[PDB]
From a paper:
[name] ([name]) is a zinc metalloenzyme that catalyzes the reversible cyclization of N-carbamoyl aspartate (CA-asp) to dihydroorotate (DHO) in the third step of the pathway for the biosynthesis of pyrimidine nucleotides. [name] ([name]) possesses a binuclear metal center in which two Zn ions are bridged by a posttranslationally carbamylated lysine. Crystal structures of ligand-bound [name] show that the flexible loop extends toward the active site when CA-asp is bound (loop-in mode) or moves away from the active site, facilitating the product DHO release (loop-out mode). In bacteria and yeast, [name] is monofunctional and belongs to the type II enzyme.
Thus, we incubated 5-FOA with the crystal of the ScDHOase-malate complex and obtained the crystal of the ScDHOase-5-FOA complex successfully. The crystal structure of ScDHOase complexed with 5-FOA was solved at 2.5 Å resolution. An asymmetric unit of the crystal contained four crystallography-independent ScDHOase monomers. The global architecture of each ScDHOase monomer showed a TIM-barrel structure and consisted of 15 α-helices, 12 β-sheets, 2 Zn ions, and 1 5-FOA molecule. The dimetal center (Znα/Znβ) in ScDHOase containing 4 His (i.e., H14, H16, H137, and H180), 1 Asp (i.e., D258), and 1 carbamylated Lys (i.e., Kcx98) was still self-assembled. The structure revealed a long flexible loop in each subunit which extended toward the active site when 5-FOA was bound. For ScDHOase, the carboxylate group of 5-FOA ligated the Zn atoms rather than interacting with the positively charged side chain of Arg18 as that in EcDHOase and huDHOase. The bound 5-FOA by ScDHOase adopted the reverse orientation compared with those by EcDHOase and huDHOase. According to our structure, Arg18, Asn43, His262, Thr105, Thr106, and Lys230 of ScDHOase were involved in the 5-FOA binding. Despite having a similar active site, the 5-FOA binding pose and the conformation of the catalytic loop of ScDHOase for 5-FOA binding (via the loop-in mode) differed from those of EcDHOase and huDHOase (via the loop-out mode).
Author numbering:
A (entry chain B), B (entry chain A): 2 to 365
The structure:
């Protein structure tokens, strides 16, 4: 069977929750073919204190000794530049994640992106310490008022001005538009990186999920299992995301936004939790897309090289030197992912066949 | 206003199912303030025979003696012009309802709207007999190679040409675009109706639901109770729909598309049954919108006059001459609507309070 050495794969947008759910999903990072994971902070309550981010990381390390964990804070008014400096100097975080209030899971304690001025001391501190600003790039929805309507389909586009202003005001701060879903955002990212020759010059980048390379509005209209934020959009939006994923440009790399929810939290007549679970087969899912696009030679950049460069991950910190090897053995995605206890999860593309599997081969 | 005599109210798009669901729902037509109901045929199996439509109507008259029932056939492959003539000749149907295959509930036995040709003999029979052609105006989805993609968001616009072609080929056939959801469809309807002041001259009309005058994509993205076909669209679309509902134009009238489903069929992680249940408070829902638009003087036209005119309902046919009186007593919508057995339904806007109630006054 054909094999591809992906090296030290990284997934820069991971949700692993807490408690039993965290015990179930955290080992799946390695099983899905991911060596390095950027852990998002939207817990109940959000991670805003040094003590809880340190304890949280250790909990993950206990659950997966071979997975490299990059941690983050949740952008909040509780944060202070002093806390940022202290946490950065103790190597306890690599970035801060911004949730606008109301747009997704555990975003109620989030920010109004019609401001982002109140957090400039925070960004100033983050810029000094080389920390990354991760953005959930969606404006809260507005329907009345002569300003024009913001809904789930244009909320990402409506956010692009805020991104451009932040990059302008903090030109040396590393910023990521997480999980791009629209062609407009892909273009905005390319235009921001127009004068860029070295991958190491990228200051604004974007992550792409597995599921936004497959899904359009039709797949989640009627299927909460496929509902997530930002929602999958129109067929042209999908096309633009795939071209970027296979483009080889250093400002687009893999972030799954694997967002596990127990099935009973998706099977609601009301208040369906947003979020798609892709961790268990993260890298194989991406392989399908690069295969169908005849672009397997670019797979390594999208899932390894560009994320390592952008986050400046050194062999000094990786918890295991094992390389993820993709081998072309068909498998079937199970119907559920379960701990054999209270938790059952419906995986992305449940019941479908993947061309590729993934294994771990030692180095040297 | 405190009281408004709405007269002989009309709901020209009603689903009452069969069995216990029907026993629960059919009396709610009257309790919702509706005197006249156009009954849709997408049962299992679809209503495609004279005998079945008679027993259905008879089942409904035993559950609601004071409700006037206009019945319909399901446009299927089993229909024949002779059946159309015979059914019209016995006053057993007032129209035939078209479902594109796969787009909505119990539509698997429906038609491909890219080849309506095979049903033209049916349309000549309907045209001679002055029956109405009700259209669920959505093309089935396609994400294929050459042709432009069709999804739940443009499927109604993608259907407008077929509507125009049908109007051109059968200029005397009364045709309704049921449940309009897009500004593009509103434009197409007015345009078709550009040279019409008499109101008996309208041949193509469109019904507007209760829920589409409130909902946008944001309200059903995470709330299956609000998922329906055609989906609620963008704020601009709602804007056109509300404007048309209150416009006083005779080519737009009320059809609820009240579509009852048991709660367990909305709380799926996949395959959520499309459909919003509005029957229990049909008229109060519409009252809210006309109040908020300072247009209560147009309420009677939208829920009574224009539908009676277009369907040519004569006092010969009405099962009760009782008048619907809207009185401003503010009530609260239950969280559930139940028969006290296996069936529970989440009503539209469950738990909200409505300014208006409705009662029945006899004619004297
Ligand atoms: O995209 C996100 O930010 C997000 N974050 C989450 O914690 N859960 C989600 O389900 C989700 F869609
Ligand atoms: O919109 C329709 O046509 C429709 N008809 C139905 O019978 N049930 C539905 O749930 C529905 F959405
Ligand atoms: Zn997000
Ligand atoms: Zn996320
Ligand atoms: Zn319909
Ligand atoms: Zn219907």
């Amino acid at each position: 069977v054909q094999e591809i050495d992906l090296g030290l794969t990284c997934d820069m947008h991971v949700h692993v929750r807490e408690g039993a759910m965290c015990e179930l999903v955290t080992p799946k990072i390695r099983d899905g073919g991911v060596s390095i994971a950027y852990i998002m902070p939207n817990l109940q309550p959000p991670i805003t204190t040094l003590d809880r981010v340190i304890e949280y990381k250790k909990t993950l390390q206990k659950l997966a000794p071979k997975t490299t964990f990059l941690m983050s804070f949740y952008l909040s008014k509780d944060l202070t530049p002093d806390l940022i400096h202290e946490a950065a100097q103790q190597h306890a975080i690599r970035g801060v994640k911004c949730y606008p209030a109301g747009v997704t899971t555990n975003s109620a304690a989030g920010v109004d992106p019609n401001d982002f001025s109140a957090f400039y001391p925070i960004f100033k501190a983050m810029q000094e310490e080389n920390l990354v600003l991760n953005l959930h790039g969606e404006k809260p929805s507005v329907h009345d008022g002569d300003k024009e309507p913001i809904h789930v389909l244009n909320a990402e586009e409506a956010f692009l001005p805020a991104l451009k202003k932040l990059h302008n005001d903090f030109p040396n701060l590393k910023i990521i538009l997480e999980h791009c879903t629209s062609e407009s955002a892909i273009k905005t990212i390319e235009d921001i990186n127009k004068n860029v020759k070295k991958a190491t010059d990228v200051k604004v980048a974007a992550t792409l999920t597995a599921h936004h390379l497959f899904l359009t509005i039709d797949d989640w209209a009627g299927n909460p299992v496929n509902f997530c934020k930002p929602v999958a959009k129109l067929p042209n939006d999908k096309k633009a995301l795939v071209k970027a994923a296979v483009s080889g440009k250093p400002y687009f790399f893999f972030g799954s936004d694997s967002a596990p929810h127990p099935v009973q939290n998706k099977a609601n007549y009301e208040g369906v939790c947003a979020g798609v679970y892709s961790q268990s087969f993260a890298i194989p899912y991406i392989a399908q897309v690069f295969e169908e696009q005849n672009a397997l030679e670019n797979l390594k950049g999208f899932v390894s090289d560009f994320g390592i460069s952008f986050y400046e991950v050194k062999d000094s910190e990786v918890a295991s030197s094992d390389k993820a090897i993709l081998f072309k053995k068909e498998q079937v995605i199970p119907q559920v992912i379960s701990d054999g206890k209270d938790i059952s999860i419906i995986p992305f593309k449940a019941g479908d066949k993947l061309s590729w599997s993934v294994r771990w081969e030692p180095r040297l």
